[PDB]
Amino acid sequence: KPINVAIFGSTGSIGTNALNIIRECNKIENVFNVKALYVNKSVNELYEQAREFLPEYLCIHDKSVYEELKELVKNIKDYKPIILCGDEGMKEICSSNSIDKIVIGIDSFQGLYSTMYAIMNNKIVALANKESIVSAGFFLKKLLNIHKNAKIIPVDSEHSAIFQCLDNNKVLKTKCLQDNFSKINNINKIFLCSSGGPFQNLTMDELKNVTSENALKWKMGKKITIDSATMMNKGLEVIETHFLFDVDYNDIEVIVHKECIIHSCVEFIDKSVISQMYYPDMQIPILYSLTWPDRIKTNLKPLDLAQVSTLTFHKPSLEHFPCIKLAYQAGIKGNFYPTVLNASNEIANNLFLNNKIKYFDISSIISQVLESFNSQKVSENSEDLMKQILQIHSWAKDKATDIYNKHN
Amino acid sequence: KPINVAIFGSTGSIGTNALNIIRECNKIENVFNVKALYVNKSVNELYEQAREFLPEYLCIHDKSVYEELKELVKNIKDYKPIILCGDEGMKEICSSNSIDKIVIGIDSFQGLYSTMYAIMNNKIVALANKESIVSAGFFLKKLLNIHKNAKIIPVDSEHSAIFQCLDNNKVLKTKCLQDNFSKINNINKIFLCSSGGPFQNLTMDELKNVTSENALKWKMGKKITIDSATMMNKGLEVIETHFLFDVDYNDIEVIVHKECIIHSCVEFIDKSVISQMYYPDMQIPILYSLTWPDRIKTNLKPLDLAQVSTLTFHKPSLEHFPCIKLAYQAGIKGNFYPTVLNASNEIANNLFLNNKIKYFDISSIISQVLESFNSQKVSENSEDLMKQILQIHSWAKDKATDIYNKHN
Ligand SMILES: NC(=O)C1=CN([C@@H]2O[C@H](COP(=O)(O)OP(=O)(O)OC[C@H]3O[C@@H](n4cnc5c(N)ncnc54)[C@H](OP(=O)(O)O)[C@@H]3O)[C@@H](O)[C@H]2O)C=CC1
Ligand SMILES: NC(=O)C1=CN([C@@H]2O[C@H](COP(=O)(O)OP(=O)(O)OC[C@H]3O[C@@H](n4cnc5c(N)ncnc54)[C@H](OP(=O)(O)O)[C@@H]3O)[C@@H](O)[C@H]2O)C=CC1
Ligand SMILES: Cc1ccc(CCCN(O)C(=O)CC[C@@H](c2ccccc2)P(=O)(O)O)cc1
Ligand SMILES: Cc1ccc(CCCN(O)C(=O)CC[C@@H](c2ccccc2)P(=O)(O)O)cc1
Ligand SMILES: [Ca+2]
Ligand SMILES: [Ca+2]
Numbered sequence A, B: 001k002p003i004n005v006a007i008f009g010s011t012g013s014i015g016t017n018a019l020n021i022i023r024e025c026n027k028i029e030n031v032f033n034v035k036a037l038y039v040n041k042s043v044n045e046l047y048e049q050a051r052e053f054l055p056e057y058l059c060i061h062d063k064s065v066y067e068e069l070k071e072l073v074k075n076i077k078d079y080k081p082i083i084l085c086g087d088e089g090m091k092e093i094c095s096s097n098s099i100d101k102i103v104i105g106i107d108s109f110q111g112l113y114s115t116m117y118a119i120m121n122n123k124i125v126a127l128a129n130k131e132s133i134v135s136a137g138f139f140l141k142k143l144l145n146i147h148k149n150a151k152i153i154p155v156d157s158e159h160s161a162i163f164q165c166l167d168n169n170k171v172l173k174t175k176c177l178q179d180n181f182s183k184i185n186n187i188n189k190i191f192l193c194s195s196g197g198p199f200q201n202l203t204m205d206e207l208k209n210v211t212s213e214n215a216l217k218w219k220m221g222k223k224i225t226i227d228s229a230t231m232m233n234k235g236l237e238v239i240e241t242h243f244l245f246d247v248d249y250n251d252i253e254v255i256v257h258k259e260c261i262i263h264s265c266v267e268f269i270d271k272s273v274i275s276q277m278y279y280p281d282m283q284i285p286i287l288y289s290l291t292w293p294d295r296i297k298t299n300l301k302p303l304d305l306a307q308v309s310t311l312t313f314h315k316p317s318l319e320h321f322p323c324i325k326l327a328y329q330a331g332i333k334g335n336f337y338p339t340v341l342n343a344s345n346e347i348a349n350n351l352f353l354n355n356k357i358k359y360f361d362i363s364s365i366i367s368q369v370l371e372s373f374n375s376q377k378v379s380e381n382s383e384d385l386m387k388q389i390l391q392i393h394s395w396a397k398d399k400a401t402d403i404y405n406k407h408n
């Protein structure tokens, strides 16, 4: 009866939100068993989680805090977890028959490795890490075609919204990333909603001057805050939409909805549009990823639409947010351009965060790396294709850094 | 896999809209066969439709234009339709094995009769007539339990919206007008959107003196236009929601949404809200009733959310729109109070339309009729129950009229 879940990246924003909603859902019935928690190096925070949830498995990626973990955990009475470390630990958890569903709340390109292994073990993968899809979309499709019982269920709020708007009667006959998913689901077009970020109303002159402090001062982590400010977050999410739902780029429309109530919309072939809405929230997306195709009761505050009162929609200016255009261009180009987009953005975003370049330099760097990249034949076997993605990702990060280094 | 459809009330608003969307859809691919048309007295319109759609059956209710119809139809080359008459024509159409779905576009209290025979013959019934559901909900539920393969599919725009927000793998485990429909679909709450009609900004003093002219001068029939002005249309729709979807009255919220883009919204038990949105429209509601659980291509204009730009929501004032409160009160009392509400409103609406009473007299009369009713032993026998509904309807109409005449 209980859904057996692993939380990968349990100490971060997604991971802690997941454990919060699991905690609430488990107050009376045993709805979920938390079988495994995996983090990078937050050994103290992991220990506190282990004390509460008592998972069968604990894993730390950073082997240097393994002893520290082992020692902390001995303090917990009558608890004999399997304590693992690194890639080998990740792979052992993914292999466990006692795990059904894995929440991937690991950030950056790193989250791809666990995603890949979770699919290879025919698990349900509740994927929040959009960089994996953007970097490796075609590769994940291939894997999902081999590993017949694996599924990716989207957790990113807009993709969760789109997924929810679908009719599960059609969803159940396909799965995310599968060729023909949009046909089977009668999808015509997607309205991909965005907050628009902190700089949405600035003039071109004002935008030239913006700093990371101006973006940082809805409270989110730094990387995503900067991506929201440039709208590269939405750019990545366009490519994410295309891969998840097999929707053509020309049928994905970015819409700025600053109230952030409507989380995205699907237009079906009859032109009817379905949308999903709630307060800005990750608990519903995470919960749904674990309960789908069912829903369960929560005690979340009900949406008060009369109090919200007003919902607004407008088209983003691609002159002001050129990251959006770069994302569409890379996605349409296909091949490894999305990998290059993501990698170069990782560098450009961090340069801006750290006050080393200007706002328009972010898109300039990314553009230059994209223009520099030469298309490669797509390796035909899975393990060569993975190595290739890694090659290009690293190449693009280095190229971005080289561009920055040369031009100051 | 052609969809075989009969249109009942084919020359009316619903009927003609149904043929319109069938016509447009069939231009894209021939999915619909119109097998039967049925009208009251519009023999010439009927002839013209018969010319286009070449239905196997034709039926007119009023015996006195039967021969005229037979005459008219002779003109049509290479066409030998079965031409039928009255209550008896309807019964034969509903019994045909070549008809899968019947659109009931017959208005007022009348529409119940053909609904019943459509259900008795295990058809899919596309039902727009909210008054039948409000007045005879308990009878329809009983019929639908006897006739296991019959289904009512809602066409009323808000109810179609609600229905379209659901997962059909769960819908297919139940059917509308069944107990536990909302439980099985994990429905928590409904937002029932309303235009708000022409009087939302009027003061109490202004409402005291509004006339039917002010109500009438979005173009619809007179009766529904007056109901939209008083918001008794929404009150009837609250009860319609309760019966169609088994949603408790305290879990239906009327919200004024004057732009009429979001057609209504379903809050699930996790507090996720899904909504259906389009331009104000009856084509998609009708078409979906006929395609459910699938959708097909249309050439309808795509919603341009950016252009719509702004969507607003507010709570209706019950002091200004007391008909809403009366509908909830009747719904919550249950029994035959909905039958009484509907019947007395039929009279009060017509009184106001004909300048015989004032705006607040509408709710006054309805209130007084409801107060004079006493709950009745609900017959377990289908035949006795229909007679109860007819008797109570007629009683309530006479009572409303008596209250009008006494004060006037
Ligand atoms: N937060 C949100 O609301 C949203 C998140 N997302 C996406 O979800 C992903 C995760 O985001 P978020 O929760 O914000 O990220 P955080 O930075 O808050 O958390 C990252 C988590 O991953 C762990 N981690 C990092 N590297 C490894 C590794 N090698 N092995 C195991 N665990 C590791 C961290 O461990 P430690 O604590 O030890 O560092 C931490 O638990 C991102 O791709 C993000 O874009 C998208 C939509 C919304
Ligand atoms: N369309 C809309 O926007 C909305 C409609 N509705 C509901 O839909 C229902 C239908 O409304 P609408 O189509 O606008 O109404 P109309 O008055 O425009 O249509 C009436 C139709 O019923 C036919 N009819 C009447 N009596 C008989 C009979 N005894 N036998 C056969 N046919 C008969 C009429 O035939 P004839 O032409 O010969 O008189 C005509 O075809 C209403 O109950 C309303 O509440 C709900 C919400 C909005
Ligand atoms: C504290 C908190 C909690 C939950 C959420 C849910 C939105 C999460 N999400 O999917 C994201 O991609 C974040 C970035 C995007 C966004 C979306 C909504 C609000 C603000 C920003 P955008 O790229 O549109 O600017 C947000 C903020
Ligand atoms: C010609 C045409 C065609 C389609 C529509 C769309 C839906 C109509 N519908 O279901 C009704 O109940 C009508 C009355 C209600 C309404 C709803 C939307 C717009 C305007 C009015 P309300 O009770 O909320 O005032 C409208 C007008
Ligand atoms: Ca150490
Ligand atoms: Ca759904």
Ligand SMILES: [Ca+2]
Binding pocket: A188, A248, A251
């Ligand atoms: Ca297309």
Ligand SMILES: [Mn+2]
Binding pocket: A156, A157, A158, A237
């Ligand atoms: Mn997102």
Ligand SMILES: [Mn+2]
Binding pocket: B156, B157, B158, B237
């Ligand atoms: Mn309606």
